[model samples]
Target chain A: MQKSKFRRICVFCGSSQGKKSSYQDAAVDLGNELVSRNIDLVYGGGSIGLMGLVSQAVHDGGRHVIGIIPKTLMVGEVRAVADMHQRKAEMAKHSDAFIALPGGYGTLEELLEVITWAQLGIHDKPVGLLNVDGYYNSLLSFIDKAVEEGFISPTAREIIVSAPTAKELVKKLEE
Target chain B: KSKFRRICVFCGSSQGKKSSYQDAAVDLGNELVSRNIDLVYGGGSIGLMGLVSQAVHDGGRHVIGIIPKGETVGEVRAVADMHQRKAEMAKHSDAFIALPGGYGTLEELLEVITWAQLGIHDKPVGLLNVDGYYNSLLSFIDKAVEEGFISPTAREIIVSAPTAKELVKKLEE
Candidate 1:
């Protein structure tokens, strides 16, 4: 096992394979990157879409994979929570850092909650976004608009460290 | 007295640049008061949070503000942390609404929407898209759907309107 900063990093992602092949490639690449760093994986549990791809990549690469799912839904070392809030709390509790791959409302919500927590001084863990082919450009633009409009402080805006690739994002988060 | 006894609103601690954003917050509050809906919100005396809560209070409606071991309004309920604060806010309200704000507001709004999708709660979630401030966000969601990340049915979970009155009415229906 190689030594590194993160023991486990929680990944937030969609349950569906997106239209672009890049998303799938990025998911697998991220999983491989974590494995290369000798870091385990903590994620929302499932064997579908990007979630499955990443977990499979990590497990195949000889890294431990932990999945946290709500009791209402039905992995590697799967732990169930009472509800969504509990699941989110557990995910944050078990991970040293967070990374979001391209996803939908649930994924976006998970990403934003951690950032909100960071802004409020709840945790010091770094949050990174795998922008993946500029998928999150519009969302980032919206955040920028928020800052320009004075709803978000410029300092808080720095909480989101985004990059176009998994390698770069993880590196930025590590730093 | 209204269909909703209490409605939770998620908004920014900092008021946005546009007057319309502030106006919508106050307008939503007044609309709630007119319909006899109490307010549950993140507690603070600054920005849209303050504007909405103040309007509802001034209109003689009950106001419940859930702050993170903090305060600034009628019937303040302090929680130990941010997560607990959001959980409490969701628990105390019949529905959820988002006024123009930042990450905190968007997160709160999305949580309810996700919960609704997961069958956690059936409460309606509305967005007051004042002056199209949320147009880009909406576009992002649409993009997610187009890319097969979000299902079309799930996309319908968000009810948005340009004005507070219209959004409230849609949520009511």
Candidate 2:
């Protein structure tokens, strides 16, 4: 029941621009929140969609943003992908927490991987999901169903806090 | 002959300055799926990289993208897949190949070759020369060979093919 001293946190969200403006806004909101609080942001290294939106929002300030990506994306992004993923794995090793937002398989995969790490006790960290517009209900149900069948511990579900807003999610984490 | 449960591909992400590269990418991906061999790539959804990945997924083969973030010369911070994890994704592959490119392309191709040379990875490594675009780099390595920069026998191990069909043939051996 203790918080990781996370001076750095990994945020997973849509690489797409998303259907709603809030998704982008939420990403930037979280970015500003992190910058305001002096926390580093680690995310998928993309220069577009929420991925780029959030990282740049924080970058306009002075705090650091770390990204993790594959080689192809790096070359296409030309310089964007190079800014992170290559070294973000090392960056995440020191991260205090992980947050996920409305995204595709990539986002879900990253959060799930972090949860698996948390579940296996490989990393004692906190995880949160910005379930805006109930975007993650089915996915949440999927995890619940996974838990019901003994795929994992019910207590582990408590590790993931789902909030409808960025502020609320952070407040929930704070409490 | 054993089933090719997994296979490696070497190609460029930039449309490779040729329409045939994209066509070859399609053919390579389709053949791999038809044969039921999974693909391991830089894990991207753009350019020729995206085309091959989409084709493989459409063909119903298990596709995995090996993504390295920061120093990744290509697709490094790109989203390859979501649930499997960026770390474990690196280990889930059985082999690798090089298709084309300048810096990022050469970087990925060379890294795997280096790994194979050091015995860190025993999987087969091959190059799809496609229109002899790789000829200069191949010859450069040959010069290294002539200068005794690397062993001649060791150089033979890095297979090269002028056509996708022939490259795939050599890669399977």
Candidate 3:
């Protein structure tokens, strides 16, 4: 997992910034790092909340960003202004890797769907969690419970990496 | 402030193990036709979700679907509409709705709603709560509200109705 091989990164964060600005800052930091590293950015297409903040920042940094959104949600979920490429809206083969911050169902879907795909051998990519404010702390614990219950393979448990900072996720992916 | 010309409908991608899901599917189609509203739905136009969009198109309304190209035609050809995936649909369409569905449907449901909660787009969300179907789901949303996860005001954005027309009414922003 060398830095050079990372052509693209898919981020899953709250559509809305959570109760803390730190989460959005994390998203911003991640986006800026991605841009500085010349990595392509893939995200949920929305001009609102932290999703919008990250995309805007990446674009502002003169980086390319691809946003995948269901067409049905474009207007209601006011979309981000960018190249704004949609992901064909098909559920099965949507994204590459996924990393999430604090979010609700959408974030959950984005992250878990990737995990499901990985478990199915759809693709062997990294899934990281930017556990800002311990946002995903309980979620990590719940996943541990699922693993113990054998609902998912113990290997599947490692598919989703939970870390407190963006760099930590990069390290996990490297390992 | 245009009246809704298009809205994406999220439903059981599986067609579900429930009959009421299919029934509600047809009802959603007719309602779309009656209002001359366009439909934006998952690419498949066959199962519960597909049925709803197909009915709407059959009734003479424009229909748009987003789906991934990787899917085997065998999985979707029985009823594929405007074949697209997440990225494609987000580019072309307007609104979203949720019907009874499994993880896939729920995934789409939450994705679209997440955008709304963040004020990304002000598109209306319609939930056809037939047979007390979404009661638990609705309660969960309330729980999220009470937990200070999201503003309780977010609840008003989703229209929960037992009937088609009522669904439309409750969906008003």
Tens digit per residue, CA lDDT, model 1, B1-173: 56899999998888888887888899999999999999999887999889999999999999988877524789988898777888899988999999989998999899889889878899989988888788889899988888888889989999999998989999999
Q: Give candidate 3's error at residue B10 in angstroms.
A: 1.7
Cα lDDT of candidate 2 equals 0.62
Query: Which candidate wins on DockQ?
Result: 1
User: Whole-model Cα lDDT per candidate?
Assistant: 0.90, 0.62, 0.64
Worst 10 residues of 2 chain A by lDDT: A74-83
| Residue-level lDDT tens digits of model 2 in B1-173 | 42456765645555644676677788778877776787777666766677777788788876766653212222233443321232343355566666654334443455455446646567777777666566655764564344333457657757888766777788777
Error of 3 at B149 (Å): 1.9
Best by lDDT: 1
Off by over 4 Å in 3: A1-102, A112-121, A124-175, B70-84
Note each model's CA RMSD in angstroms. Answer: 1.8, 17.8, 8.9
Point out the worst 10-residue segment of candidate 1 chain B by lDDT. B64-73
Q: What TM-score goes with each of the models? A: 0.95, 0.48, 0.54
Q: What value of lDDT does candidate 1 attain over all alpha carbons?
A: 0.90
Q: Model 2, DockQ value?
A: 0.02
Retained native contacts per candidate, as fractions? Answer: 0.85, 0.00, 0.17
